[PDB]
Amino acid sequence: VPTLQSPTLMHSLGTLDRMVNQNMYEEVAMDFKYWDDASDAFRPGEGSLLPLWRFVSDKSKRRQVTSVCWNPLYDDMFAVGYGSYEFLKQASGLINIYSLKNPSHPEYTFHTESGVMCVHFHPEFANLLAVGCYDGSVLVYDVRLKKDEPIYQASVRTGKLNDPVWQIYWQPDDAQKSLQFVSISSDGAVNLWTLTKSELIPECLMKLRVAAGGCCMDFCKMPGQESIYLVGTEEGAIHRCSKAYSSQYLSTYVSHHLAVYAVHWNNIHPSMFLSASCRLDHQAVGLCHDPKRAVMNFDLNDSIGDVSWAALQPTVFAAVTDDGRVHVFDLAQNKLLPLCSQKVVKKAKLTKLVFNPKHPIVLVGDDKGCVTSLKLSPNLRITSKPEKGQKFEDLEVAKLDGVVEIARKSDA
Amino acid sequence: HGPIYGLRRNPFNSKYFLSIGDWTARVWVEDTAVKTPILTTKYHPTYLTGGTWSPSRPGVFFTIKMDGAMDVWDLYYKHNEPTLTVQVSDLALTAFAVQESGGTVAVGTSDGCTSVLQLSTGLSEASPAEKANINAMFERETTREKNLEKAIKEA
Amino acid sequence: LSLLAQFQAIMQRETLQQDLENKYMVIFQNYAKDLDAVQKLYEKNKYEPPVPRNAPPVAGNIMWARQLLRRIEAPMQLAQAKESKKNIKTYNKVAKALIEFETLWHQAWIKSIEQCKAQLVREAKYMQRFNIRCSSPSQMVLLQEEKFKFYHNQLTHLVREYEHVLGRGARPHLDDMERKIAPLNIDGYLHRFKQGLARLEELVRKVVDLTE
Amino acid sequence: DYIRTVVQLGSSVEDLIKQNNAVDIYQEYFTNVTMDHTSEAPHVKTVTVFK
Amino acid sequence: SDIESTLTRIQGHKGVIGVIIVNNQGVPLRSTFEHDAMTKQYADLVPGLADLARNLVRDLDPQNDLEFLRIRSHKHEIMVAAKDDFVLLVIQDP
Amino acid sequence: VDIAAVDETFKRLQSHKGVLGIIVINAEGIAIRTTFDNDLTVQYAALVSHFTVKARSAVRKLDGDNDLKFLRIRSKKHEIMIAPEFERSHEYYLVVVQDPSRE
Amino acid sequence: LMSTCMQFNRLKGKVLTNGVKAIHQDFTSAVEKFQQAKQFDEDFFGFRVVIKELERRLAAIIIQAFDDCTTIGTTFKLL
């Protein structure tokens, strides 16, 4: 009943602040949606990311972007998981949540007390955000409550991975009495978590045996089925199993010598994943059979932060290395050379690349606690348009398969 | 085992009876082929003495022990360890009762008094069939093990 | 070089097969160029080399050196006569420098295991799983880590649980536990402090339900 | 003069309409989400002890 | 401590020259200005425009209301968030 | 002929997403081109004429040398956009009605 | 081959009964594909692959159901 503390005052003030901040970046946003690079219908063989919004907060500069994730419904949310990767500069972690509606001030925020080495939003409900931490504590945060604190934790009583939790995921549990989580850790291996009464309980999935359980630092699951996923290691190899111990390492795609840093499936042609390591080469390899060779190889000058197939097309993909250059390949215009290699940051080593499902932009993330958002010039995004007698998934299977057979019989 | 102290049919859907009497807290069934438990639960410490079910929620139970507890054993969610261990007294509990609407319990202790508890919205339910189900399926495995001894000896 | 192998495999004419031996010198120019570039990385980054992620500082520098050596060495198996002499000399100085790291840093690690073994109690017993891969170990290898991250995980919990029950106070109670917190015998003290906090986790909730 | 004015205004407004379609400003996230996931651990209260 | 932090953020951007909150009839409470010879100008000129615009919108189909309003002059962007309790003003040249 | 140009501007504007309506009204509150029926037309013309002359008098009173080239009122349904061009021999506050919900 | 076939004719718990149903579904499907003179060694080692490959579903759905044994003697109901 004092008007100057009424909640609806704060509501309309927040909307008026967005209404202000829009009118401070009008060009950056109008280009985000209504602009096509007019000088790439003239030179067919290359492209040019155009840099857009930049997102910094003053608690971030002492921190390093250590994950990024996008929300299923709205397509203006991020989830930056600021944290640490150096062995000697170990800090407390952070997690903002940003928006495209205001880029300057984050909508939400939290403040953990170890390095947030992953995030993931839930796909169906659209708010609950699972995270992990440098010290095994997987956490779950609920967002619309506006209480700067978790709603569940882990302990050493329920379950604790005991070393960094590099990646976590959300499983769809269909209208059941639960929600599901799959994880991965340096010591020991994959664990399943549930969301019970007021707790999160481990169930162990498999152990990554080779000295000790071999370390591992990433995994991805195939969308189109669920059980079969791809797991990195630090012994070097890449493994693939299913949600069982059903032939521990169903596939053992072994080709590497160091810590692999990224794997990725590609949403079209469900047999073909690429991967990427810290041996300065990323390899785009086929999986139904084919476990002893790589269809291709793309060497480069500094080790890979990460890789990502495009959401909109299974030829183009992009990769991010430890120099300042994001470089992005079309696998069907050039053949072993990057279509567009551009340096975006000045004095930081980039470390995280994430695409966007609907609008065509990309997020890349620094070493200095910042995230910067690039746009893809039209030569990078070329989806073969469907027609009357054919389906869109089929043409994009066909392009990749043609490139695969060409370089398969041309390699040897 | 030994001097039995528990007996109660289950309510709210069916006829499966209980046996919380000695320091194992079973759940038994009434058929001429199943003369053996269905959901045997934990071998405990502190020799058991008495409890029942819920008449407003399917198949929880509530032991008491000679050092005293209301173990709110929810029994479709865990199956080994007491979901909620509360010690009302140090002295040994020797009774039990349930409010007819469910949500108030009573035990008088080893000397004297009588303590009346109150259990929150954990006591209500949304689906009463699958708990008849998992207390139906889980003893055809026992009749299945009755077949095996004939099969073993005939082999 | 893969292209040259394919062109060898395409066709047969004995003059051409006496001409596809020639182009290995044109190949050999660029390997020298790569042997130039890696050489620059060696001298520009001798003391403070960038590393892989979450890598410890002593023998997570060995891996960087090893990467440069094994980047330059694996094409040498395939590209094997005057220019070849100067290039094999330049390679054979880069080789000795890229063993100069991977022996002097290993020595510095020997004397640091003497230092730190008595936060950083990790690295002197966390390195020896990086070190166990290629090089040789030292005294009292990490046979003692099946306890020590039990010893830190239980013991940042129960001490942590001695804040929440002291968030429900508002005293001979706390007496009995400050006499237990303070004191190969870190087993029984964790016994004692777990049975210690079960007792007062009971007592404080009793007092709250009989006071509210 | 009327024609020139109308096309001038059409240009300006066309820019504005793009501005409103670019990103929607006036949209509160989670305007109405009812499903809440909460804390439901068992509570034991002794209302009175009958003695 | 959320209302005043949003005031302090919103008054420190690249073009903002003044934030005003005014009550139903008047009384501009919590201005932001180093003198008050032009706050009263805003407070007694602008909510006439806000409720006049609520008349214009609502007249058409009475399920409808007004929420915000912007007037962009040459050198100013007067944004008014009108509602039942009050009227709120933010002034900014882009 | 420029009549094709202005009608083309109507399809330029009207091809955008959600744009329900375009109308042009002069200083005497009488619509010239429409896109609506006739009575929603005349009530827009009267209402917006009076409202925009009040708003321009407000801005001119507030500061002597500043005028307005812009006006934007909001609904929960549709964001009416008014633009005016105050001049002599022509002052044609065109008004659009749109919303991004549709389609 | 028929010795393995007999031993595989001897086939929380809702999920795990569904799992050992999948193990039975596959072993039947595999042998019925084999229901159709020195290239039988190739299908023979394919079937060796399947047996020592679907013997790990068993070890997995018995590791996951050996903690949740309750007492001294639930383990022989599940062993």
Curated annotation (Swiss-Prot), chain A:
The gene is ODA9. Is essential for arm assembly or attachment to the outer doublet microtubule. Coiled coil: none annotated. WD repeats lie at residues 111-151, 160-203, 299-339, 345-384. It is found in: Cytoplasm, Cytoskeleton, Flagellum axoneme. This is Dynein, 78 kDa intermediate chain, flagellar outer arm. Belongs to the dynein intermediate chain family. GO terms for cellular component: cytoplasm; dynein complex; microtubule; motile cilium. Consists of at least 3 heavy chains (alpha, beta and gamma), 2 intermediate chains and 8 light chains. It comes from the Eukaryota. Keywords: Cell projection, Cilium, Cytoplasm, Cytoskeleton, Dynein, Flagellum, Microtubule, Motor protein, Repeat, WD repeat.
Curated annotation (Swiss-Prot), chain B:
It comes from Chlamydomonas reinhardtii. Belongs to the dynein intermediate chain family. May play a role in regulating dynein heavy chain (DHC) activity. May function in holding IC78 to the DHC, or in stabilizing the entire dynein complex. Keywords: Cell projection, Cilium, Cytoplasm, Cytoskeleton, Dynein, Flagellum, Microtubule, Motor protein, Repeat, WD repeat. The gene is ODA6. It comes from the Eukaryota. One of its GO terms (cellular component) is microtubule. The keyword Chaperone does not apply. It is found in: Cytoplasm, Cytoskeleton, Flagellum axoneme. The lineage of its organism: Eukaryota, Viridiplantae, Chlorophyta, core chlorophytes, Chlorophyceae. This is Dynein, 70 kDa intermediate chain, flagellar outer arm. One of its GO terms (biological process) is cilium movement involved in cell motility. Consists of at least 3 heavy chains (alpha, beta and gamma), 2 intermediate chains and 8 light chains. Disulfide bonds: none annotated.
From Swiss-Prot, chain C:
The gene is ODA2. The chain holds residues 517 to 774 of 4485 of the full protein. This is Dynein gamma chain, flagellar outer arm. The lineage of its organism: Eukaryota, Viridiplantae, Chlorophyta, core chlorophytes, Chlorophyceae. Consists of at least 3 heavy chains (alpha, beta and gamma), 2 intermediate chains and 8 light chains. It comes from Chlamydomonas reinhardtii (Chlamydomonas smithii). Dynein heavy chains probably consist of an N-terminal stem (which binds cargo and interacts with other dynein components), and the head or motor domain. The motor contains six tandemly-linked AAA domains in the head, which form a ring. A stalk-like structure (formed by two of the coiled coil domains) protrudes between AAA 4 and AAA 5 and terminates in a microtubule-binding site. A seventh domain may also contribute to this ring; it is not clear whether the N-terminus or the C-terminus forms this extra domain. Force generating protein of eukaryotic cilia and flagella. Produces force towards the minus ends of microtubules. Dynein has ATPase activity; the force-producing power stroke is thought to occur on release of ADP. Belongs to the dynein heavy chain family. It is found in: Cell projection, Cilium, Flagellum; Cytoplasm, Cytoskeleton, Flagellum axoneme.
UniProtKB/Swiss-Prot annotation, chain D:
It is found in: Cytoplasm, Cytoskeleton, Flagellum axoneme. Coiled coil: none annotated. May play a role in regulating dynein heavy chain (DHC) activity. May function in holding IC78 to the DHC, or in stabilizing the entire dynein complex. Belongs to the dynein intermediate chain family. Consists of at least 3 heavy chains (alpha, beta and gamma), 2 intermediate chains and 8 light chains. This is Dynein, 70 kDa intermediate chain, flagellar outer arm. It comes from Chlamydomonas reinhardtii. The gene is ODA6.
